[PDB]
Design a binder for this molecule. Structure first.
Ligand SMILES: Nc1ncnc2c1ncn2[C@@H]1O[C@H](COP(=O)(O)OP(=O)(O)OP(=O)(O)O)[C@@H](O)[C@H]1O
Ligand SMILES: [Ca+2]
Lengths: 138, 365, 395
């Protein structure tokens, strides 16, 4: 299933979380890393990702599976790009993590990096997998 | 292992050297000198300044962004081969970019570095990010005023937030024109380019920030105790009074020049209000000054005062003025490309040959 | 409280060597320009000649050595054998440089005239001439002194010269007494004194500027082509007019000289009120040159900004201090040793100054001590080590 791709993307240990979430019609988590954060993300958050108000979450932030994140870059609605870059938010010096969302023809690919892993590696992996799936018409 | 080259960019000057070191090896004005019409041309730097009386000068960057790529390549040739004299295909190269540099620009930077100089690796770092790296910090707000552009840039975990970036097309050269103008109105006659460079040196040597501008204007109107003299190379002496602080007051009130624009303090505040509510506290506590135009004595205290007057009585306000901040950016670049963790951060020539330039948009942020 | 006072006492040896009036002027320059100014040691006969204000001083062309004893240490002998520090082969090279100067006519060879106030200094104050006694065979008072480790004999003639009762020095060559000679100035035909050699000059990053920093060997055609006939700084117009003055001023200064130091030489030579090419920094004075032999540098001296010495707590970092260095009165500072010098630089850079460096100081000493890249780095990069600690929280 989609979990085979979650398994594949997590293999190299750079990322701590990964998921594939349908965003069309009513969103739903198609596949996710068990026992982590993304599996409990709700459809309304996806609706916020793809919604018309692209400004409020800059000031109020948002949570994903309860982890607060800030949107750094937004190219999620641009053809050829289809990506949004975020980083998690912490309290009391607790580590923060890089997040990448990519948008294919049918799915959202979500990745959470480990401690200190730079967002660019996660971004490269997620975009290349997304390109592979779009190439597969997904 | 390899000293990666550090190559800063700027509206007026350039700074270059080897990564892992305390100060730039080499610096020059980035302008290029074509003939006036020819074999014996000298294109770059102090040589172009020296020959400037018989040469035609050009600036590749205006308001931080590269324009004439053609001679940016010449500036790179002079940096790599003449100032550091080290084969840049042999070393990874750290590059710097102005805020909001157009997408195709950063692609052309990549194309030039990889196709022309066959660099084994590179990184592009935003100057303000280096400035925050430069002293103890990964998160905070940078007020970067250089020669071209003024930016207020909140940064979270080392990542500028472009949505909240504000830009102000007002910097030192407009102040220079203004100072020449209002110095003439004091009874003097500053009008030439030589006179422009002299007024520039006066501004650099004598301006400071008044804590109470109206009171200071009153003090200057009621005596000459703060007035200074300056001796021209022709030995003639001019005197400057309240202009000393009227000039930098323009940073807070551009209306002094007939401009309908907020001062840096209010635009810093508006920048903060565009940011996540939850990180502003740290931003409030990490206000970083960078650029030669932030070197005025008294600017940090006055900024503290203005924000305090504007901000909630609860808000903690901290103005950080690193003392060499006019070059702190370059230090940060040396640091960044120094690191082992940087090994992943290298863009490789192979990635570019396989995937093309658009990886820079995905990988470089 | 001797712990600081011996650090005070050792500077007293240079204060014997170098006049406090000049320490006043150069301290005022160190206030007016926000720079550190180093200077090599000079010694008390140099005090006598500086107090004379009478004569030109040693330069670049006159590569002959600052002499090592007595009256002659006041000057440079025509024979370096009377200037014995370093070894024979080196004094032979210096005699080479003398012969070169003589053939070039950038040195003449000149006769040495001393007046009783100088003798009274040398015997009484300086303890460095032995009592004269008349010999009717020489028609001169014989004297002796340990010029090297050897005591050597000299015969001194009281002569009416410029209508003063000068002593004229003489020495035995091949058993015959010959008048003793020193380097004379080809222009004034008067003996060149020792210069002031300079040690590092250090500036804040706030004026780090390549149009000032760059070191530039060239000479005439390259300069006069480089600058258009009105990209002018006034004296440079004469450099358009004359190749000779360019060769004197830039060629001797040329060294590995930075243009900032080229302007500052004009500033300092003006400020010291000397005239007619009289100077004390003609050498251009970098200690970037390849022959920056180390032990000549000591004990050294500086002028530093008044603001400099009230800046923060002692014990800056691994470079640490508890007794505030070899401070001297008249605002001056002194240093005994490369470790003290290197610590003083390491602090100055922690006042965000930038240190000039040269491998020969380390090569002189054969312990790793002056690499900037590694060793002489300032503790704001220790603060980047704290930045990486933060990232280690990230990383
Ligand atoms: N002593 C001084 N006092 C005030 N301003 C100064 C001083 N020295 C230099 N400047 C100003 O600093 C500016 C150059 O700084 P810097 O090289 O950091 O800018 P830049 O990076 O080229 O500009 P930008 O960041 O817009 O590209 C110039 O506007 C110059 O007038
Ligand atoms: Ca810049």
């Amino acid at each position: 299933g989609w979990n085979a791709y979650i398994d594949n993307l997590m293999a190299d240990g750079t990322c701590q979380d990964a998921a594939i979430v349908g965003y069309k019609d009513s969103p739903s988590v198609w596949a996710a890393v068990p026992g982590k954060t993304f599996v409990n993300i709700t459809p309304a958050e996806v609706g916020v990702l793809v919604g018309k108000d692209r400004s409020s979450f800059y000031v109020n932030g948002l949570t994903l599976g309860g982890q607060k994140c800030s949107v750094i870059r937004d190219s999620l609605l641009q053809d050829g790009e289809f990506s949004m870059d975020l980083r998690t938010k912490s309290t009391g010096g607790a580590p923060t993590f890089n997040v990448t969302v990519t948008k294919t023809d049918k799915t959202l690919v979500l990745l959470m990096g480990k401690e200190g892993v730079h967002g660019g590696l996660i971004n490269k992996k997620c975009y290349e997998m997304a390109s592979h799936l779009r190439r597969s018409q997904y | 292992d390899i000293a990666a080259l550090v190559v800063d960019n700027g509206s007026g000057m350039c700074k270059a050297g080897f990564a892992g070191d305390d100060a730039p090896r080499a610096v020059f004005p980035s302008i290029v000198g074509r003939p006036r019409h020819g074999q014996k041309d000298s294109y770059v730097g102090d040589e172009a300044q020296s020959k400037r009386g018989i040469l035609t000068l050009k600036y590749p960057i205006e308001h931080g962004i590269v324009t004439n790529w053609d001679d940016m390549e010449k500036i790179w040739h002079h940096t790599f081969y003449n100032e550091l004299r080290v084969a840049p295909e042999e070393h990874p190269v750290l590059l710097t970019e102005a805020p909001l540099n157009p997408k195709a620009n950063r692609e052309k930077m990549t194309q030039i570095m990889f196709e022309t100089f066959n660099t084994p690796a590179m990184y592009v770092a935003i100057q303000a990010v280096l400035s925050l790296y430069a002293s103890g910090r990964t998160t905070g707000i940078v007020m970067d005023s250089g020669d071209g552009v003024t930016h207020t840039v909140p940064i979270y975990e080392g990542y500028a937030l472009p949505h909240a970036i504000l830009r102000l097309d007002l910097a030192g050269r407009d102040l220079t024109d203004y100072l020449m103008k209002i110095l003439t109105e004091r009874g003097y006659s500053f009008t030439t380019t030589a006179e422009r460079e002299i007024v520039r040196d006066i501004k650099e040597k004598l301006c400071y920030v008044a804590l109470d501008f109206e009171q200071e204007m009153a003090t200057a109107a009621s005596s000459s105790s703060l007035e200074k003299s300056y001796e021209l190379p022709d030995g003639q002496v001019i005197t400057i009074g309240n202009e000393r602080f009227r000039c930098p007051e323009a940073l807070f009130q551009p209306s002094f020049l007939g401009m309908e624009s907020a001062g840096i303090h209010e635009t810093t505040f508006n920048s903060i209000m565009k940011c996540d509510v939850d990180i502003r506290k740290d931003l409030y506590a990490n206000t970083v000054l960078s650029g030669g135009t932030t070197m005025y004595p008294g600017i940090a205290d006055r900024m503290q005062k203005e924000i305090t007057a504007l901000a909630p009585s609860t808000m903690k306000i901290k103005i950080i003025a690193p003392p060499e901040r006019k070059y702190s950016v370059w230090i940060g670049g040396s640091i960044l490309a120094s690191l082992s963790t940087f090994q992943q951060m290298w863009i490789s020539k192979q990635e570019y040959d396989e995937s093309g330039p658009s990886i820079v948009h995905r990988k470089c942020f | 409280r001797d712990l600081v006072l011996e650090p005070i006492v050792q500077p007293e040896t240079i204060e014997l060597g170098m006049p406090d009036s000049d320490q006043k002027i150069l301290a005022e320059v160190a206030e007016r320009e926000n720079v550190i100014i180093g200077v090599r040691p000079v010694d008390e006969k140099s005090k006598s000649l500086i107090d004379s204000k009478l004569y030109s001083s040693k330069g670049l062309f006159v590569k002959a050595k600052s002499s090592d004893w007595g009256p002659m240490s006041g000057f440079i002998p025509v024979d370096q054998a009377f200037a014995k520090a370093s070894a024979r082969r080196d004094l032979d090279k210096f005699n080479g440089y003398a012969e070169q100067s003589i053939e070039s006519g950038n040195a003449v060879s000149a006769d040495l005239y001393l007046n009783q106030v100088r003798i009274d200094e040398l015997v009484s104050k300086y303890q460095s001439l032995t009592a004269l006694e008349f010999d009717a065979e020489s028609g001169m008072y014989k004297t002796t002194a340990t010029n090297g480790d050897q005591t050597v004999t000299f015969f001194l003639n009281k002569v009416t010269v410029d209508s003063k009762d000068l002593w004229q020095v003489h020495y035995i060559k091949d058993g015959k007494l010959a008048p003793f000679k020193v380097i004379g100035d080809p222009v004034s035909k008067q003996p060149m004194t020792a210069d002031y050699d300079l040690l590092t000059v250090m500036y804040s990053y706030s004026d780090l500027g390549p149009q000032d920093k760059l070191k530039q060997p060239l000479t005439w055609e390259q300069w006069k082509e480089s600058v258009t006939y009105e990209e002018l700084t006034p004296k440079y117009k004469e450099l358009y007019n004359s190749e000779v003055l360019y060769n004197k001023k830039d060629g001797a200064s040329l060294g590995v000289v930075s243009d900032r130091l080229k302007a500052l030489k004009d500033v300092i030579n003006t400020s010291l009120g000397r005239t007619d090419g009289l100077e004390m920094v003609h050498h251009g004075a970098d200690d970037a040159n390849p022959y920056a032999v180390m032990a000549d540098n000591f004990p050294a001296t500086f002028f530093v900004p008044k603001s400099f010495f009230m800046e923060d707590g002692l014990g800056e970092g691994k470079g640490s201090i508890q007794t505030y260095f070899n401070v001297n009165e008249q605002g001056a500072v002194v240093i005994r040793d490369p470790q003290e010098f290197s610590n003083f630089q390491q602090v100055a850079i922690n006042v965000s100054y930038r240190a000039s460096l040269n491998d020969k100081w380390n090569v002189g000493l054969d312990d790793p001590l002056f690499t900037p890249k590694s060793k002489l780095s300032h503790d704001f990069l220790n603060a980047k080590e704290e930045v990486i600690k933060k990232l280690s929280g990230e990383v």
